[model samples]
Target chain A: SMIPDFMSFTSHIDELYESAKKQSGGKVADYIPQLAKFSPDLWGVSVCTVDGQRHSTGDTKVPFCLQSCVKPLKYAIAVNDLGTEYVHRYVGKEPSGLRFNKLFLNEDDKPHNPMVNAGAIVVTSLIKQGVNNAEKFDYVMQFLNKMAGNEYVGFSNATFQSERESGDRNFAIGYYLKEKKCFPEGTDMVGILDFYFQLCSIEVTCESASVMAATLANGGFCPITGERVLSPEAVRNTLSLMHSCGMYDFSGQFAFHVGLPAKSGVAGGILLVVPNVMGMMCWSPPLDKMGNSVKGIHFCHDLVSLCNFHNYDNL
Target chain B: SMIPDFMSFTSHIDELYESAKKQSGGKVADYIPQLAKFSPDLWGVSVCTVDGQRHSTGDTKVPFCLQSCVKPLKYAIAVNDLGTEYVHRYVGKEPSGLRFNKLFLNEDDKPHNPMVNAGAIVVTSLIKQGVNNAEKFDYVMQFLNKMAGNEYVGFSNATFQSERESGDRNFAIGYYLKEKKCFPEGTDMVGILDFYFQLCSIEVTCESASVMAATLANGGFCPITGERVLSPEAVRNTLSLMHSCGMYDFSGQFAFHVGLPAKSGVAGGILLVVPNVMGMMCWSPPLDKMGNSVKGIHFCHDLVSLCNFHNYDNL
Candidate 1:
């Protein structure tokens, strides 16, 4: 695989990403109101290399919710706060091998990993916030701001409220985890879930997310601004887990082909990282069979194959 | 968690294994005549520790077949031959997350991970059996004999012939892997699959199988005779993967409760490992919802909880 120049790759990506972004055969995620209104054609791809170079095509600047794509970095922060061995007690490294939303916790009832909805809820509960939901949400906001290198990491209050209303599955998961002693007592499922929803609502344009991916690729240091977003070890382990378990049930195929550390959202945002290489942001509001951003995964698959960017290649 | 005494665990496992031994809930894999007539109430569990200690209950002396359990060990041997990076290119590390008989490969068209039917078929195809299928089968037998510290670890021709007749899914998977270029050319899917089925049907008493578990637990050295069965890294990684993905659909629950590395067969036998601890064998003939030996799992779960012998706990 060869890493193509951004300008050279842009035209091809634009055409491919757009074609691959064709209307998703699946229905929209109606659980969130704000998300339901957006058209599915909002597709884009932005690639940033480790040398601070950037390339983009399609709706690269259209703001979209980060969704599950926000999870890995947030989880890494928690892992950095709590060491890997300690953090794993509440979550496992295994793939549930079930649907992303399936409540198949290990017998200890630990969420399978931080990538799925169940695991993400537990991870969100673990993050110490200010005092209340608002403060906790603000903490998530600050973390997003830090990742995006900006104060305005957009939060859709409407989406957050909608998520809080219909998020019964997530609530069930959180409460179950609490009951299993997987999470600390006094971890309010509702309060934590509201913050979790709000955190998921954090918005980023494809451009900014590419920068975020670049930051992860450059060993927690942003390629664009040279700022550390996570500890190197935490980032490495996080990426390793992501490569192994991200993208719901499609993770194995994603790793085998794209070979990048990526987390996808039902909202059609994919934040992917090529460790020590570059980061990527791809969008297509439509989802595939696995509820991942259809266009984003397609884009990554094509991009990786075209660019020879898989992680396992010899240097 | 506490380990139950040999008899207590055995009695429970017997009830469970016996219940599912002759079950027709799922297919008995009847293409193979030998397995077709096999009783469904043939479930068993065999556990071995690093120190050569062993415990067994119901069906301990009963000889049945080994199914997917051969996968990790064989893949271990193949990994020794080809190395991890090379083997990984043809297979994967993450769980396939598909039904055991699902007919698909990853996007890269690679069989996803060696534990699944697809990857196992590919691995069996990778066996360097000098000239033909018979020679390759010989290699597998020799490998098992060495791993189990039993010179007579050979295949059951009757079972092999029977499985060959009914092995459509495996055939499909093997052919698909071959088509994907995962298997070497000139490797006849029929020949490879015949050997695969025969390998699956190898007869071993639950008691001796526990010794195999002990071998793996002791890092591939047979406890009874101290013969090196596999590389140290192979045993460790194999167990780690098994701990994460070995129990078919019951994998998550297995990790949560039993907290051991193990594999199970439709025949209701389980081969389990406790890493640096001990190995024992328990058997019954019943199956569970996840196709595992029902009582075997419960027995192990109770045993671990009673004995407080979790992988995480230091005794």
Candidate 2:
């Protein structure tokens, strides 16, 4: 399907990925000491083509916090739960061009976009089919597990508690949304907030995250195990959102340069999609100006420039 | 319905308004030459209580462009056209907190909020019933006429042409929204933009806009003339949005300090609402960092402090 372009193209991608893994570095999110436990030198890369072919290197087995990378995906689920009609009544789909943890709401009191901290707070409020705290956490895990070939998901209770203590900004966003009646009454604002922060604290290795991205790239199917994780519509909606708002203030520039649907976490993780082509993940314990993996961006830059992997230019 | 103990509040408000007017040194928007014709010395204040009592001082009869102030009211009509359910599918209600003219789009390609230039472009695109230029202009004028209780709602051809030539930032916002299908196909992008800029250019004396604000305050009925200009729900929604996003970047501080539903224009106009209590307008050629009239801000601050006119506080 790739015009039979081989050997040279594959090697070029490999070399770029290796160089990207080296060129990236940054500060860890020790805002919570639990998140600080990650090895700064930990790094990995995994690429899975739509045909189920895979390549991986470095600390592919090492796991780290997903941090903000989970935002767009959960937002996809939240939007699915409420339907676009109802979900948009409380959230927007615009880039704020501001930082992730902002204290303000837009004029209507809804969060700006699901990819931002404010929008994610609203998404956490929309987690469905669970009556109590325990049930809600289970719901999120269920959603993620189904998408990852029933892979086991674990939480860092210490991270959850630490995040709860220091997550006043997220709390402010949720409470403000509550005051605006953006969330339903008696929705357990604190519980939902805790759940959201914990979701950010989920431990995922580059290989795992790449599989998740591949699930999305494969139209919601797990490429390795051959299982459907998301509906086609849900996958499309999620990717479309990631393409637009995933990189925070850097989104426009990211799209202009990389031209891919991807989400990055503060813990040096990036899960990217090539829509029907491939799913790639790059993990390095360093960050850039927008809290993205520094090495990951360099890798993407070199990969697209050298291999013409950019979606817009070729497509 | 305010406590009789606050009977002397009006004097305090007058003094604060006077002080704020003196600091009128904000940069006036001179992108369009027509708006640049204002005198830097121009400042005015007018307030109408719930009982139809009026208090006015300074250049209270001065005429100025409404500019972005027409957004919330027009949003009401657009929402009514398709309902919030259908309307939000195209545009979001979240605040981006970016400058009004920055071209940022959400993941779904929706503009941030209707109160900003980007969101207003989407709202203008929603104006149906006129497939062509004149009809589009007429349809929007009718809405404004109904809201203001003045029949001379016509386009300022010179201002529209000027803005069309120079309003590239707004045009960029429109083009992005158009690509996202937030606007209709064959929607005559420039034509819709002309209608939007012309609507802002509608020459309204402080008195006329005050009447419009009074109509909104009294649940769609003009407090002075008893004409229904909006539905109760529509009025409520409009005010809610204004409370959060009306003054641009200063919106939060304004909400914290003044606690009123208000909108400002670069043409040195401010429209303030006290829900069921009063409608007020202030005009000053001097601008603030947030592109609001400095004198209008001064007047509103005094009015709120002295009269206790905030929507959150009892009056």
Candidate 3:
């Protein structure tokens, strides 16, 4: 508990969350029916110190699928299981400077980082090799649950089903990765996409996500459970990618302004980490044109300004 | 004065220059005869500390045109004359994610950044507008000489003449900017491009260019002259652009690896600035495919590694 007074910290964040909630701009992601169902009025802000203290406000208990936020987790898992040298053979580490789901590759003909859809699918295939879809999905779920400190790891079957039914863009990315030989030899492309969708559909409250992010901030050790869920190298690599390529096209601007490692999902969740200090999850159902959570962005901006937690603040 | 031992510094730089000179890969830029005339063996290294110490080695006096390296200087001058609010209205602050000379603009229909060719041309039009080309060129040269502490600010008539004769790409960019109406009202489009080509054809030795870079490193103050050369805000904006978009297509990697403000020219010159520390210039007439100096890139990589000058090193 480096955070000396939890009450004041939570109170300040609560104020920020309330202020951010009044922003009327942006639209609820409605590309799919399941995503369109979320109420744009819902907003949540949750904070977890690296030493395990937790504070949450608003719709902190509301559960939502991970969406694109799962990409960084999947990338860390793959890099933890397989070394960076092995995993990066099929994925590049640079930003594509385009839409997240754009069918493009880096100079090496590999997906440009694991934060994007193509790279996420490639990383999913690198997860535990399974004879069947159940085996692979179970393996990922087990680790994800452990990473979240066993808090609210629910699955939204409807969202998963909807994503699978209306995922033509993702399908194009998957086929493009396959054509680039980005997957392991003879890997099942359909199973990989299924696992990716399932991972994206894994739902958690803002509170649980805050803990998950704190786990990363704590160098892969779950602060509550005292368990090492991921390697330090994996966390370092994941944080670097999240800092540079997390918020789709808005990643560069976010890095320049917020100066923190953060990943945002289309479901309006942002998992942000302040290195050795704290981790936060802000969820709101409205997204900007770049697919970043509007309220989440607002909260992060205000949080850094008030706390002086930007990475380059001293520099 | 803070750098107590100048002999050791010059000796080390001399050694580095000798080592870099051995790198034989990459070809000389041969799009025009003026740039194609330089001998590949003419390598040089010069460094000027913010505390007003200078060191140069190996062909440091061999003059070369600024080429693309003039982009940042022109950008800073424009920002100094007109505030960033006015300058940035026609130039963006983000990377284009394309080649420096690529026919592209940012999402706001402005040149992506002032470090690119299109953005530089737009910025050039913002300079002290003269009724004719000579007056405009003289205005730019005066400020440029002041920035370099009146060291070496020579005009390359041969290069300028060749550029005007074989500048279809720049002509296309000018027309595109004209069509987009990126310039201020009643601005002369032809005179703007003429000023741009003339600015690029401005010649400087490694020693002089290092002083120019030192002006930026000292926060717009020329270390030798003890004079304010550019506004602090203008220097800050220019450094940010140089860090993000200065090395053409290799900007991101250079920023990640070298972690300095730098701009490279097709004539095989690189102007580097270590914020609040030192300014450097490396020249060798051989260019990478991306239009950056080959030996200069190698020199920067080794320099940062030995000095631990990475911007994100603490993180």
Candidate 4:
């Protein structure tokens, strides 16, 4: 009874997806040629409920690099492996300001939350610590694979190479965090940066990422697999920060308008979590002024307008 | 079977009650003589699930003043009546900083969120706006009574009078907001302050307040009454702010540790909503240094420790 009348529920989503498809503005991320290759008209949406109900429409099977969408997932893995308090020692729980500087640290000399690039780099160093880059990456890939209920989790070597060549911004962010001693005592900053680059290059189709987000929505348990991939504490903190600080500079407006936790990437992929209800992946390779997917944002607004899936909507 | 094993659930809450009982520190609110009258040993807890399951322990029948706990409740009522956009036009959604200045507004000249005094007063002016105090008071009482499944909701005339007499801080806050034009076009600041005091003095036993909170946990539907007393938008915004800003100065630490939406009052009551699972009322007259109920905080820490009722705990 959580979603009464299941048949019409999916049919209605198809309608919303088609309606959002008509929203036509924003530029494809041209920071790198790999990101620039996707068509602006390519839009996809997939929904997976906590109880495993699902629907997909338009280009749902196409693989796209997760880009920034991987931040929340890796943070969840770090916290699940290293515990909440330990993971948060180097990163804060409060959000950074919209016009934040790359060199800034909170008063405690910590990155402001796990949803930004600086915090994401520190969080990246904490994952699979004491392991080689290949091992750490496979560990996360395997973890995310389970998070997606054994769905297609692939790697785009072209994007990874391109990100490494053009990773000047992240390197500055990584080294600034290094100068501030943001990483653990023994990790290499260069290796962590490389690993962070690899994380961004990890690929998921809308079909698979919807399940990964659903795992978060379902309290770290994958709906189809029914396997607990994250600790309750990990899911709690990740979702909490995602709601408080995700979506780059648009987080406050996103939380108010969409009333959900969502993370977006330069690839124009959006990983949206409607807590205790469903997870949705909305992809459109066109960036708004805030660098969010124009069509993804449109779909989210329409989705909440149609469904009572907002976190407090059903308490 | 959301809670597959309900048999031991009630028994375990009793265990948490006994353990938290050993915690012994804090002073009762002394600003108002009437508030200082309750014994520090007067502890109570009540839990109400969305499906109408109920449990009580210790002094669950004892009446207590709502005090600051009325902030989120009244804000909800405001949004329900005035709509979210109209009400928020005078208030910011972000939390004010710790050690905040009482005369502060956000960068936009709006009060910082609805859980604080200035925001609460502004929110008060929006409620029942073309009506007199008598009609407005009765309207909210009817709403709260319905929210509590018509359980015991009463008034403490002595507490109201005492609060009004000793409301120097609130009066200054009211005047400051008036200076900032936080009130609506025509409402009198003095009248609003008196109404705010009356709201603070509205009394509820732990039993009834749990149902009120459960109504929030159930997305604005009274579990026992099964009546939709608030719009989905109203419930969503209220719970969102409660999680983000409700604990006052303790909010950040509480969110990191407790990871649930909660509001506490000087009268030593904590309204804890473990979203979509249950609502709890924990009361003890002893106040922590942060002006929250010491025993109520202790119970919250232990409750989430035992049961995975945290919002992120059960997706």
Candidate 5:
């Protein structure tokens, strides 16, 4: 009901997928073998509309780690549980302007926003704070499965274990946060890092992630299942931060060019949301210098150019 | 078409007017008696939907100078004539945290944004640059008429003349902007201020200004007449700036609470846009310490609380 000429609208993605193959030069994130194992040739895109229309191309079924893409998702869940004011009390709402993972805080002595490592770690501590990691992870897993419409929401212990072993930057940030007393009272900093790493290691194929994005685009209601996985407060805050700070230091440029809320991860996935319309997951193994998916970024520009999907474009 | 049940929507406004009247505090701008001549008890609201549905309550027919509410309209005209890239070359898009009328510049050596005195002067000079003052004024009058759907857009020459007499801060700002070469080549700083004062002196009834807000809500199309008064570029940029910087020192808080794009002038008017839905002009003579309308602010909070019309509100 929202989109007109649905068939021709899909005609857009088919062409977009073909032309995006021409973006050939970015490298895979080499920090860990699990992520580095993906073939550079593997690229995929999947789309799901709020009305349950679906489309896919290339390696959409191949499971991959969410990496940093999980930041917006977990931030949404925290707000859903605790509400906006409480969640934002620990983390701020503005873009950091600095590079990713800086130790600097916003004016309130809180992490700048939830999209970065420091803020995401603090958000991790806020979820099910009294419960153990086992209960918290499964509680969030329930949300993930429902948001993805019971599709391929899985976990990769190999990636999780590897991150726990080699997550030097994250541990450093966690320690600094603990020293600054950034977490809520009576919190365990080490446990929060473990929980945060596991979230990043949650796995989804492009198809499932696209539905998660649609849940956000549809304002917290899962499209296929007709269930509410998040509150409106949660969805709006997540999308707001994603629009303002989702791409790290590259945020201002992307918000100007693509004019949409999106989050990219080291595993070469872009979780893109066109609010009140459709959602998409764009994935490619190779990443650009800024650590975003190479083909995914190009594909977004082309799609927006061909369509009036830019947030500020003509109605 | 935008409103599901138009008549019931009107019922909502009738009660809101009474509730806002109970909210009584603040002072009128006393720099000029023409502005201070208005009664503190004078309050009104008018709404125009994108579908051309209309509603009003109390004093909607009285005229008031737009004052600073004209900033967004003139900036929109500039962007419609020159593209975004060129206009932004002289001004920024960020909301400056300083008090109003400061001479601070953004990092690019340009004015912080078009909503401020310095930036608004730059935008005024950019319009009809080579023409005589009469032709330029008439040129923009045509745009104002079209955007307001040929509604009341009279002038308050007494208010205009008053501004020139007591225009110390604005002249200081204008001279500072010229000192920094903020304007395009071959610009007259004094002429620009004269032009700026006249634009602010442009008078509109609550009923007429509501249609102008509806034009913006309709994406630059005058909803009542079905006329395209501004390009998509102009409409989008104007709305973006209004959302970011419209309420002077109170922008961030208004954005957090109302989550809508709105501009409030010292004449006690708030130009509000519910994008893709409706537009409203709330006018009252009493202003809060921050230069925003007191009862008008109360009316807005009540309106959004009941209507779910916040920019990021759920579907």
Candidate 6:
């Protein structure tokens, strides 16, 4: 397998991981009780090549809720299921230039992007209409598992409960999206929020998420199982957006320097893709001021330099 | 001179001018009496190439207030006088996603860009500060005249008087910019406003405005005079802002479809720049709901189709 050849670079990546881990900075996300409980010392990094190579270090098996990391997946799923034209009818494709959770819409009266809560809710609404919560969750769960190549897809009921209980900002976004008629006709708003919270509460290990990222990097085919989970067009659209708007407030800066398609979750997880090359997952339960994983971001900066993997890198 | 070959395209452009003239739509800008006095039937189009080519049709010689079309000129002047970093300290480089005259600021409490009134006022304040009104106006006039290659840069006393007398929105914007400390220390708010309105009241025919636009299209060198009016960096920065935020509410749509750096005036003028190619000025007193020239937008759509001048078009 092509996996063995990349083994030569594993030790160098280990040095980067150790360097990033030593920089003890930032605070664990505290918006929700569940997220607040994660130890700041818990750090992990994993890499999955599009050719099926896998490398991991530290707390690679630690479980954490996907949080906002589910946005790109939700977007890709909606695009694959409904087509870009129909999916974009409910959500726009631009940066909001505000806080990720800020209650604002783009020029089209639509949420800025799927990565924001408003746009994610709109994407959630389009996942599968007219289905009961159980059926919808089943469909999403199966989809995620397929993307992760049958790797473990954990669920945290406590996180889901806390999300539903203390999600006023999300509720405000949901109502605004509804007032804008962002959802399909006769859609249930509460059910969509419930689905959204469940998706955010979906759990994954850095190792497994690396596989999911690899699926996107490999143009929607799961690297391990080689199963096509999303269309090529869907992957392209999702990657383009993930590159432009995936890091919330840090998006513009990240695009300028790191120059990769990346998304971050408040749980201090980052999923990054190097198209046709490798996918990476970094987990460090302390976040920068903008809610990105500090160690994860540092690792990304070093990794791109060490590997010359920047999208615009002359190499 | 390369001006002669483009003479053949003049008749076809004239045909387009006649077709757009027949579509009597949109309203004339009524905010200021100076603009409202313009006959809605007055229509004109002019083009100036980077190679000093020129074309004209209809009322191309009729003088009218440049109005908002002067925004990019002011921005380029500020950037040329002061480096971009210093100029951008008071302005942002993103679309406001609001009306052109909307009383709003970006997250950094900066006006969105120089194309908007708030940013334009900030740009004006940066021009020849600590000087008398006459000196400041003279500075801007000389800068604009140089950009226009000594073309007609008429002054409308009535337009300037009306703008200062009835410009409550601009006054509000001026106060907000002051509150934000957007002006340099000891900057006069009234003087800045006076200069801003004076800049707007500076008149140009469609033919003369086309030369100014061509200067920008040629990366800040006046094509006719071959004079470096703005640095290449200044031109690039101005074009970037104009491409993203120039057409007010229609900026995103125009960028997506027309794919040009353009600015529009409430007096029903559109100055469009096709980088490294040509610049065009379209004038029609009828304004779209977004305050852009109705016939100008239609002309752009047809021109881009006829010549495949879209920035993304491979041809």
Find the candidate with the highest TM-score and give its number.
Answer: 5
lDDT of 2 by residue, A163-273 (tens): 888877777777777787777566877777877877887776676777788788887778878876566545655775676577766665565457678898877888888
After aligning candidate 6 to the native by TM-score, how far in Å is the CA of B278 from where it should be?
5.1
Candidate 5: give the clashing pairs. Answer: none
DockQ scores of all models, one per candidate: 0.10, 0.05, 0.14, 0.37, 0.28, 0.06
Off by over 4 Å in 5: A24-42, A94-107, A156-182, A249-257, A285-294, A312-315, B26-38, B93-107, B157-181, B249-257, B285-291
Evaluated on chain A only, model 2 obtains a TM-score of 0.91
Best by the lDDT measure: 5
User: What proportion of the true contacts does each candidate reproduce?
Assistant: 0.18, 0.10, 0.02, 0.53, 0.27, 0.00
Can you write out model 3's per-residue Cα lDDT over B1-315, one digit (the tens) per residue? 234577786777777777787898898989899878888888889999887899888889988999889989988888899887888888887677645557788778888778778888888888887557787778888999999999998989899999999889899999999999898888889888888888989999999999999999888999899999898668877876777778888886776557677999999999998877788899998998888889999999888765555543322
Order of quality (lDDT): 5, 4, 6, 3, 2, 1
**Cα-lDDT of candidate 5:** 0.88
User: Which residue segments of model 2 deviate by more than 4 Å?
Assistant: A3-10, A97-100, B1-315
Model 6 misplaced regions, further than 4 Å: A1-25, A32-115, A128-182, A198-264, A267-286, A292-315, B1-23, B44-61, B92-100, B104-113, B145-153, B172-182, B207-228, B252-261, B273-279, B298-315
**CAPRI class of candidate 3:** incorrect
* Interface root-mean-square deviation, candidate 4: 3.1
The positional error of residue B11 in candidate 5, measured at the CA in angstroms, is 1.3
Cα-based lDDT at residue B143, candidate 5 = 92
- Best-to-worst ranking by TM-score: 5, 4, 3, 6, 1, 2
Q: TM-score for model 5? A: 0.88
DockQ, model 2, C-alpha based: 0.05
Question: In model 1, what lDDT does residue B35 have?
Answer: 53
State the weakest 10-residue window (summed lDDT) of model 5 chain B. B93-102
Cα shift from native, residue A69, model 4 (Å): 0.5
DockQ of 3: 0.14
Error of 1 at A241 (Å): 2.3
**Which pairs clash (backbone N, Cα, C closer than 3 Å) in model 4?**
none
For model 3, residues A1-315, the per-residue Cα lDDT tens digits are 335787888788889988998887789999888889999999998888887888988999999989999888988899899977898888877677656667788777888788888888888889888568888788888898888899888899999999999988888888878887888999989878988889999999999999899888888988789899998668877877787788889887776567688999999999998887787899998999999899999989898788767654422
Candidate 6: tens digits of C-alpha lDDT, residues B143-239: 8899889999999999999999998888988888898888889998988898888989999999999999999888788989998999865787777
Candidate 1 regions with alpha-carbon error over 4 angstroms? A1-6, A18-26, A313-315, B1-113, B116-315
Q: Evaluate residue A46 in candidate 4 and report its C-alpha lDDT on the 0 to 100 scale.
A: 94
Candidate 3: Cα lDDT at B275: 73
* i-RMS for every candidate: 10.0, 18.4, 4.2, 3.1, 3.3, 7.2
